Amino acid sequence: KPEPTDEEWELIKTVTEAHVATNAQGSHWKQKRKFLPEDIGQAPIVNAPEGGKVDLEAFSHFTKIITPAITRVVDFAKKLPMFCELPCEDQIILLKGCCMEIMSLRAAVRYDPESETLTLNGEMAVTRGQLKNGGLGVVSDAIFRLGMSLSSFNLDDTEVALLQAVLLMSSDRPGLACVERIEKYQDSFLLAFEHYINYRKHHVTHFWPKLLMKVTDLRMIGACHASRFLHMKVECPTELFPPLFLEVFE
Amino acid sequence: HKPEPTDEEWELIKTVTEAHVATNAQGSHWKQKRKFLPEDIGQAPGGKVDLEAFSHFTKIITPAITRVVDFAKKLPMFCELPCEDQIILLKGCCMEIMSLRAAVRYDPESETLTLNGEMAVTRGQLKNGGLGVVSDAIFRLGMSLSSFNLDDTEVALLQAVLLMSSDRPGLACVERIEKYQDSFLLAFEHYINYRKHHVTHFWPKLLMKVTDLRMIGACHASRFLHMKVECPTELFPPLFLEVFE
Ligand SMILES: O=C(O)Cc1cc(I)c(Oc2ccc(O)c(I)c2)c(I)c1
Ligand SMILES: O=C(O)Cc1cc(I)c(Oc2ccc(O)c(I)c2)c(I)c1
Ligand SMILES: C=CC(=O)c1ccc(CCCCCC)cc1
Ligand SMILES: C=CC(=O)c1ccc(CCCCCC)cc1
């Protein structure tokens, strides 16, 4: 199995550092985290015939720490030379299209089977039900499943970073100008990623193929996020929408 | 570097591994032949046992039980123990090894456990099925074992350790058994350094799973008493009754 080249190790060091420099609570999150009160995000005893509405209370708790998560995704991308080479127009499109994907990933990787929750921003542990009633709905199930399936993969910072790099450089986003260039960047990240994986030596058959499918799951989650956001603008009042949160979809 | 298994330990590792493989339902992918228990079965509209769901479990309970016994008998160290000791050890690890085997077959995508490698069931089906909370304990164990990526050898060794529990009430060759367990832990410990898993504090956390399997085995004993009160005698296979006397 071909391992990463000197140049790729250089690239790997750039992404890993960029990710670690933007990944909250890089200093033990499962020790300083705080569990969201049980009473918050509790399944409705009545359940409206509509189809389940968004728990405005839980939603408030989620959006109160959403901005930092969004800005962090932007800082990560700006720490990558390749990204900084892209036009302003392209950068915005790529960020708005991978924002939720990368965040969902960051949360998924922080899945704790013992408490069966996700540590958002590495400080808030939420249950599958709390995140759902919080406004993500079925999306919560998608993210939780992802986290459960990623356990056996034991992804390190370099693999999560590279994963984020691949999600960031999506040349299939609508409106992109440097379609070709961006794809060259992605292929570079993918190549370095795969090579790094051979170096890591994971104990799981068809690791590479299975991981790529996860990129596909993130794409689905990101899309469902946009649709889920539409219901939020309908049920959730404006006062609960942070500055960057709304622009990420508008 | 960490110490790896010696030549003598490799042969022991070979024995236990082949013993487990010969008594386990895989070596051919259990996801290609497994079937899902009808959703309508084991539905939950303490708690009463779902007779129908129960019947489906005990219908394949004997095979699982007989395999654990076969596993132990394929181990020379076990055959050197008195009949009374063998009976004691088996009755004390049966559910332990069984739970372990079911846990390792956990499937995140379907969120179920493939019993005997042919019947997949949900947390609810197994709970109302008669295991109650024990079902949650087994599913929890299965979820925490994903990152461990245990191979047949590690599960086999794990079963060996559970088997050679010299603290079982009534045992006679307590020291001979203890000696056997350590030989497995040592070989297991060395094998672990060979594999080299990417899970921080792998060894410590795995050993802890052994303690969880201990609790699961105990909670099942008390759970079995509820079954002999709610479930009719017909649904109790002969070998199933004796094992958990
Ligand atoms: O875990 C991290 O670092 C990043 C992170 C932060 C948050 I707050 C988060 O939850 C969301 C996201 C969108 C949304 O509309 C709602 I309501 C909740 C997730 I998923 C991930
Ligand atoms: O999966 C395997 O190979 C072995 C296996 C087989 C069975 I059937 C099983 O379920 C049980 C066990 C005890 C009990 O009282 C009831 I009701 C159901 C489990 I957990 C594991
Ligand atoms: C959708 C993405 C954007 O347009 C976007 C969002 C946020 C930012 C960062 C602004 C500074 C925020 C304080 C750190 C830049 C661009
Ligand atoms: C509790 C364990 C036992 O005592 C035990 C259980 C089963 C067997 C196998 C008997 C063979 C009959 C066909 C399965 C032997 C011993």
mmCIF file of N, CA, C and O and ligand atoms in Angstrom, chain B residues 62-63 65-66 69-70 86-88 90-92 94 239 242-244, ligand 4:
data_model
loop_
_atom_site.group_PDB
_atom_site.id
_atom_site.type_symbol
_atom_site.label_atom_id
_atom_site.label_comp_id
_atom_site.label_asym_id
_atom_site.label_seq_id
_atom_site.Cartn_x
_atom_site.Cartn_y
_atom_site.Cartn_z
ATOM 1 N N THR B 62 -31.045 -23.158 22.526
ATOM 2 C CA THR B 62 -30.284 -24.391 22.717
ATOM 3 C C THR B 62 -28.992 -24.418 21.904
ATOM 4 O O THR B 62 -27.918 -24.663 22.450
ATOM 5 N N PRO B 63 -29.077 -24.175 20.588
ATOM 6 C CA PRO B 63 -27.876 -24.184 19.746
ATOM 7 C C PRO B 63 -26.768 -23.291 20.296
ATOM 8 O O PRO B 63 -25.598 -23.678 20.321
ATOM 9 N N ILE B 65 -26.353 -22.323 23.396
ATOM 10 C CA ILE B 65 -25.876 -22.905 24.645
ATOM 11 C C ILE B 65 -24.901 -24.051 24.392
ATOM 12 O O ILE B 65 -23.814 -24.098 24.972
ATOM 13 N N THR B 66 -25.301 -24.973 23.523
ATOM 14 C CA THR B 66 -24.476 -26.133 23.198
ATOM 15 C C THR B 66 -23.132 -25.750 22.584
ATOM 16 O O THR B 66 -22.161 -26.494 22.695
ATOM 17 N N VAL B 69 -20.591 -24.783 25.335
ATOM 18 C CA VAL B 69 -20.111 -26.018 25.945
ATOM 19 C C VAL B 69 -19.078 -26.667 25.031
ATOM 20 O O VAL B 69 -18.050 -27.164 25.495
ATOM 21 N N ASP B 70 -19.360 -26.658 23.732
ATOM 22 C CA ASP B 70 -18.456 -27.237 22.749
ATOM 23 C C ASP B 70 -17.148 -26.448 22.710
ATOM 24 O O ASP B 70 -16.075 -27.017 22.539
ATOM 25 N N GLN B 86 -16.245 -28.193 35.736
ATOM 26 C CA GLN B 86 -16.650 -27.840 34.382
ATOM 27 C C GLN B 86 -18.092 -27.340 34.388
ATOM 28 O O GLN B 86 -18.407 -26.314 33.790
ATOM 29 N N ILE B 87 -18.962 -28.077 35.073
ATOM 30 C CA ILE B 87 -20.370 -27.715 35.168
ATOM 31 C C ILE B 87 -20.512 -26.329 35.787
ATOM 32 O O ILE B 87 -21.287 -25.499 35.309
ATOM 33 N N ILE B 88 -19.753 -26.091 36.851
ATOM 34 C CA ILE B 88 -19.785 -24.814 37.549
ATOM 35 C C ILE B 88 -19.339 -23.660 36.656
ATOM 36 O O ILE B 88 -19.989 -22.617 36.614
ATOM 37 N N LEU B 90 -19.158 -23.566 33.259
ATOM 38 C CA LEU B 90 -20.080 -23.403 32.141
ATOM 39 C C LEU B 90 -21.346 -22.646 32.538
ATOM 40 O O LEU B 90 -21.754 -21.710 31.852
ATOM 41 N N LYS B 91 -21.966 -23.052 33.638
ATOM 42 C CA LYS B 91 -23.183 -22.399 34.117
ATOM 43 C C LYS B 91 -22.930 -20.952 34.515
ATOM 44 O O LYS B 91 -23.871 -20.159 34.639
ATOM 45 N N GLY B 92 -21.660 -20.604 34.714
ATOM 46 C CA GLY B 92 -21.327 -19.251 35.115
ATOM 47 C C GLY B 92 -20.854 -18.336 34.000
ATOM 48 O O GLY B 92 -20.825 -17.121 34.172
ATOM 49 N N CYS B 94 -21.797 -19.217 30.529
ATOM 50 C CA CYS B 94 -22.701 -19.449 29.407
ATOM 51 C C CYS B 94 -23.307 -18.144 28.889
ATOM 52 O O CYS B 94 -23.088 -17.766 27.738
ATOM 53 N N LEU B 239 -32.361 -27.997 27.802
ATOM 54 C CA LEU B 239 -31.004 -27.520 28.045
ATOM 55 C C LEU B 239 -30.975 -26.070 28.520
ATOM 56 O O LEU B 239 -30.032 -25.642 29.184
ATOM 57 N N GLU B 242 -31.784 -26.212 32.506
ATOM 58 C CA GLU B 242 -30.657 -26.717 33.275
ATOM 59 C C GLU B 242 -29.502 -25.726 33.387
ATOM 60 O O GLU B 242 -28.973 -25.504 34.474
ATOM 61 N N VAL B 243 -29.111 -25.138 32.261
ATOM 62 C CA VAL B 243 -28.013 -24.177 32.241
ATOM 63 C C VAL B 243 -28.165 -23.094 33.303
ATOM 64 O O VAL B 243 -27.227 -22.809 34.047
ATOM 65 N N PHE B 244 -29.347 -22.496 33.373
ATOM 66 C CA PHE B 244 -29.602 -21.442 34.347
ATOM 67 C C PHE B 244 -30.465 -21.947 35.496
ATOM 68 O O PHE B 244 -31.488 -21.347 35.827
HETATM 69 C C1 LIG C 4 -24.818 -26.426 32.174
HETATM 70 C C2 LIG C 4 -24.113 -27.187 31.258
HETATM 71 C C3 LIG C 4 -24.313 -28.570 31.182
HETATM 72 O O1 LIG C 4 -24.407 -29.213 32.218
HETATM 73 C C4 LIG C 4 -24.400 -29.249 29.830
HETATM 74 C C5 LIG C 4 -25.338 -28.830 28.863
HETATM 75 C C6 LIG C 4 -25.413 -29.460 27.644
HETATM 76 C C7 LIG C 4 -24.565 -30.535 27.343
HETATM 77 C C8 LIG C 4 -24.632 -31.189 25.979
HETATM 78 C C9 LIG C 4 -25.500 -32.467 25.994
HETATM 79 C C10 LIG C 4 -25.656 -33.021 24.591
HETATM 80 C C11 LIG C 4 -27.134 -33.040 24.189
HETATM 81 C C12 LIG C 4 -27.384 -32.351 22.840
HETATM 82 C C13 LIG C 4 -27.213 -30.830 22.954
HETATM 83 C C14 LIG C 4 -23.640 -30.956 28.301
HETATM 84 C C15 LIG C 4 -23.568 -30.324 29.527
#
